[PDB]
Design a protein around this motif. Sequence first.
Motif, PDB file in Angstrom:
ATOM      1  N   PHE A  49       0.837  -1.064  -0.264  1.00 42.67           N
ATOM      2  CA  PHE A  49       0.041   0.244  -0.115  1.00 42.67           C
ATOM      3  C   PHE A  49       0.677   1.286  -0.176  1.00 42.67           C
ATOM      4  N   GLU A  50       0.270   2.179  -1.232  1.00 46.21           N
ATOM      5  CA  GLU A  50       1.085   3.412  -1.320  1.00 46.21           C
ATOM      6  C   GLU A  50       0.432   4.433  -1.351  1.00 46.21           C
ATOM      7  N   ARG A  51       0.771   5.004  -0.336  1.00 46.06           N
ATOM      8  CA  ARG A  51      -0.350   6.660  -0.065  1.00 46.06           C
ATOM      9  C   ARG A  51       1.222   7.651   0.333  1.00 46.06           C
ATOM     10  N   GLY A  52       2.412   7.330  -0.277  1.00 38.61           N
ATOM     11  CA  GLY A  52       3.029   8.521   0.206  1.00 38.61           C
ATOM     12  C   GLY A  52       3.183   8.630   2.219  1.00 38.61           C
ATOM     13  N   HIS A  53       3.575   9.672   2.541  1.00 38.36           N
ATOM     14  CA  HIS A  53       4.406  10.036   3.359  1.00 38.36           C
ATOM     15  C   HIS A  53       3.737  11.091   4.463  1.00 38.36           C
ATOM     16  N   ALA A  54       3.686  11.268   5.799  1.00 39.00           N
ATOM     17  CA  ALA A  54       3.247  11.995   6.799  1.00 39.00           C
ATOM     18  C   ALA A  54       4.171  13.140   7.993  1.00 39.00           C
ATOM     19  N   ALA A  55       3.457  13.701   8.097  1.00 39.56           N
ATOM     20  CA  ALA A  55       4.265  15.181   8.888  1.00 39.56           C
ATOM     21  C   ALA A  55       3.344  14.634  10.237  1.00 39.56           C
ATOM     22  N   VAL A  56       3.691  14.501  11.289  1.00 42.00           N
ATOM     23  CA  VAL A  56       2.852  15.041  13.088  1.00 42.00           C
ATOM     24  C   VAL A  56       3.275  15.746  12.904  1.00 42.00           C
ATOM     25  N   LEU A  57       2.480  16.707  13.876  1.00 42.15           N
ATOM     26  CA  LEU A  57       2.531  17.637  15.348  1.00 42.15           C
ATOM     27  C   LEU A  57       2.149  17.401  16.585  1.00 42.15           C
ATOM     28  N   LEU A 123      10.795  11.833  16.429  1.00 43.19           N
ATOM     29  CA  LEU A 123      10.481  10.364  15.683  1.00 43.19           C
ATOM     30  C   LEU A 123       9.494   9.834  14.343  1.00 43.19           C
ATOM     31  N   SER A 124      10.721   8.699  13.621  1.00 42.40           N
ATOM     32  CA  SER A 124      10.074   8.878  12.257  1.00 42.40           C
ATOM     33  C   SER A 124       9.788   7.487  12.119  1.00 42.40           C
ATOM     34  N   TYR A 125       8.802   7.036  11.918  1.00 42.90           N
ATOM     35  CA  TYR A 125       8.620   5.706  12.118  1.00 42.90           C
ATOM     36  C   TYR A 125       7.584   5.017  10.883  1.00 42.90           C
ATOM     37  N   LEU A 126       7.696   3.479  10.724  1.00 40.59           N
ATOM     38  CA  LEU A 126       7.189   2.942   9.461  1.00 40.59           C
ATOM     39  C   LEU A 126       5.716   2.705  10.888  1.00 40.59           C
ATOM     40  N   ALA A 127       4.990   2.718   9.592  1.00 42.60           N
ATOM     41  CA  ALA A 127       3.201   2.859  10.661  1.00 42.60           C
ATOM     42  C   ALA A 127       3.012   1.329  10.130  1.00 42.60           C
ATOM     43  N   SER A 128       3.413   0.789   9.369  1.00 36.11           N
ATOM     44  CA  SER A 128       2.867  -0.896   9.222  1.00 36.11           C
ATOM     45  C   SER A 128       4.008  -1.602   8.185  1.00 36.11           C
ATOM     46  N   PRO A 129       5.294  -2.123   8.202  1.00 30.63           N
ATOM     47  CA  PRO A 129       5.631  -2.403   6.862  1.00 30.63           C
ATOM     48  C   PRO A 129       5.854  -3.221   6.680  1.00 30.63           C
ATOM     49  N   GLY A 130       5.560  -4.136   6.747  1.00 34.34           N
ATOM     50  CA  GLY A 130       5.046  -6.062   5.979  1.00 34.34           C
ATOM     51  C   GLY A 130       3.915  -5.327   4.878  1.00 34.34           C
ATOM     52  N   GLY A 131       3.168  -3.966   5.044  1.00 37.46           N
ATOM     53  CA  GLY A 131       2.217  -3.976   4.344  1.00 37.46           C
ATOM     54  C   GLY A 131       2.173  -2.811   3.435  1.00 37.46           C
ATOM     55  N   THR A 132       2.843  -2.076   3.990  1.00 41.86           N
ATOM     56  CA  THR A 132       2.141  -0.264   3.554  1.00 41.86           C
ATOM     57  C   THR A 132       4.226   0.269   3.643  1.00 41.86           C
ATOM     58  N   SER A 133       4.299   1.377   2.822  1.00 45.25           N
ATOM     59  CA  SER A 133       5.955   1.993   2.853  1.00 45.25           C
ATOM     60  C   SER A 133       5.465   3.281   3.570  1.00 45.25           C
ATOM     61  N   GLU A 134       4.525   3.200   4.481  1.00 41.43           N
ATOM     62  CA  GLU A 134       3.988   4.916   4.743  1.00 41.43           C
ATOM     63  C   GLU A 134       5.619   4.906   5.891  1.00 41.43           C
ATOM     64  N   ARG A 135       5.895   6.149   5.870  1.00 41.56           N
ATOM     65  CA  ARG A 135       6.973   6.712   6.962  1.00 41.56           C
ATOM     66  C   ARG A 135       5.460   7.671   7.047  1.00 41.56           C
ATOM     67  N   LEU A 136       6.118   8.315   8.840  1.00 40.78           N
ATOM     68  CA  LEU A 136       5.491   8.994   9.759  1.00 40.78           C
ATOM     69  C   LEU A 136       6.601  10.501  10.574  1.00 40.78           C
ATOM     70  N   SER A 137       6.378  10.974  10.371  1.00 41.64           N
ATOM     71  CA  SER A 137       7.487  12.139  11.242  1.00 41.64           C
ATOM     72  C   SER A 137       7.222  12.955  12.131  1.00 41.64           C
ATOM     73  N   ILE A 138       7.338  13.077  12.982  1.00 35.45           N
ATOM     74  CA  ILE A 138       6.669  13.764  14.544  1.00 35.45           C
ATOM     75  C   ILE A 138       7.354  14.408  14.514  1.00 35.45           C
ATOM     76  N   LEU A 139       7.038  15.782  15.044  1.00 34.67           N
ATOM     77  CA  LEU A 139       7.983  16.793  15.858  1.00 34.67           C
ATOM     78  C   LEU A 139       7.190  17.689  16.707  1.00 34.67           C
ATOM     79  N   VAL A 140       7.615  18.196  18.336  1.00 35.94           N
ATOM     80  CA  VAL A 140       6.333  18.586  18.822  1.00 35.94           C
ATOM     81  C   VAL A 140       6.963  20.289  18.644  1.00 35.94           C
ATOM     82  N   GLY A 141       5.619  20.832  18.767  1.00 34.02           N
ATOM     83  CA  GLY A 141       5.073  22.521  18.573  1.00 34.02           C
ATOM     84  C   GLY A 141       5.128  23.004  19.753  1.00 34.02           C
ATOM     85  N   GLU A 142       5.862  23.805  20.372  1.00 32.56           N
ATOM     86  CA  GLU A 142       5.291  24.948  21.444  1.00 32.56           C
ATOM     87  C   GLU A 142       3.981  25.491  20.556  1.00 32.56           C
ATOM     88  N   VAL A 143       3.235  25.632  21.719  1.00 31.25           N
ATOM     89  CA  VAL A 143       1.621  26.374  21.929  1.00 31.25           C
ATOM     90  C   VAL A 143       1.295  27.145  22.575  1.00 31.25           C
TER      91      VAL A 143
END
Lengths: 202, 205
Positions: A49-57, A123-143
Amino acid sequence: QQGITFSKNDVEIIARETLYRGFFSLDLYRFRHRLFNGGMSGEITREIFERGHAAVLLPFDPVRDEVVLVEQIRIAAYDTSESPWLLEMVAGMIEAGETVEDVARREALEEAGLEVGRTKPILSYLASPGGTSERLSILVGEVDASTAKGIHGLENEDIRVHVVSREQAYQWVEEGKIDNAASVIALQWLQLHYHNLRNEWT
Amino acid sequence: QQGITFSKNDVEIIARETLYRGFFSLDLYRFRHRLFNGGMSGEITREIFERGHAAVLLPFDPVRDEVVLVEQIRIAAYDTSESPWLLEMVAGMIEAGETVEDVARREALEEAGLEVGRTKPILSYLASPGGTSERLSILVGEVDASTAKGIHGLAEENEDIRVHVVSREQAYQWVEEGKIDNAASVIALQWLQLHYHNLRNEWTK
Ligand SMILES: Nc1ncnc2c1ncn2[C@@H]1O[C@H](COP(=O)(O)OP(=O)(O)OC[C@H]2O[C@H](O)[C@H](O)[C@@H]2O)[C@@H](O)[C@H]1O
Ligand SMILES: Nc1ncnc2c1ncn2[C@@H]1O[C@H](COP(=O)(O)OP(=O)(O)OC[C@H]2O[C@H](O)[C@H](O)[C@@H]2O)[C@@H](O)[C@H]1O
Ligand SMILES: [Mg+2]
Ligand SMILES: [Mg+2]
Ligand SMILES: [Mg+2]
Ligand SMILES: [Mg+2]
């Protein structure tokens, strides 16, 4: 030599084929790979499953020791969850030329009405690498969580902002009230690092 | 605090249409849902990857403060990772009429040659719920790391899966450093870093 894994020189990708192309894609990878007992596998195929990659805050207010969560429906949660409305991190897909930080800052404003001060990578992680290439990269943001409220989202995006203490959000992870990977990983990280992060940002 | 706003009754799933059906499948969910400010949406469609659900076991030796990891190729990791061979938790897909624990214990034996003592739930998470339904349920399992028969490399499953035994601190350091970066292992090892002190006391009394 603990934890040394086999490498990319131990696998031969033979071909990549697209099985389905729509909003996302489903690809077939054909490959052969080295075996731990020596020698090579035969040709293997896997659906990907190829859906590109994501950013998380993770929006964290270090003065208030609060996190800002966004609530929205995720229909895929329906079959295994109490409700398909989930409490989540700000997040978005990344397009060419954009950085993780670009997307995180833009989505914080669009999804939660939040301006963001400093950010730090988590951290940057692979969501479920047995079936999807998706990687998500997490930042903490000051709000400023005292500003955070209301209904946001664009395009069939309906999002409600919630502000909760860090300790309550973490307890909700332990209890299963927050149970999507990005929020679990981000809030566990926060529970391990909040002391020094609050010190750094005050 | 109050928590989520709406329930299953607030959504109407109109249809689930097959986009692709092979080993796994891709469904087009067509639905309408209640809006925070009132009323229902129009029809929305989402492409959803359907691959069933999984059980995950963190094998923890509380006497030695060690973790058992398994290594195998995950080809989907290739494009964004140092290697497609990942250091992971024991894990397997759940079939009808099996519990999470049934699968966790079976995979501990099949993948690492391990019997498990006590277990505790860690948590159950949705891998990526904007695009896949997959849920993974993690347990921590009490193991004697010396007894991982998979250490010998000898079973046939060990052509595909290799066993690593490391200290908890090393495994967690590898999370911090990005060497271990698959969701199930990150979640399990962050949990262990938050809970190991009480867990070791519980399981060594
Ligand atoms: N499954 C889908 N099918 C069709 N269109 C979709 C789908 N998902 C999103 N869109 C469209 O794209 C827009 C949303 O885009 P952004 O905000 O950048 O992505 P995100 O937050 O959804 O996903 C980010 C991560 O968080 C989640 O957990 C995911 O699993 C990811 O891992 C929607 O308005 C739709 O129009
Ligand atoms: N992409 C694929 N395409 C086709 N067949 C596959 C694929 N992946 C697995 N198989 C077949 O299924 C068998 C493996 O089945 P089990 O051991 O119960 O599942 P797991 O450990 O892979 O997946 C468990 C979780 O861990 C991972 O992170 C995944 O993302 C999951 O979330 C292979 O031998 C193949 O025949
Ligand atoms: Mg989003
Ligand atoms: Mg958005
Ligand atoms: Mg497995
Ligand atoms: Mg198996």
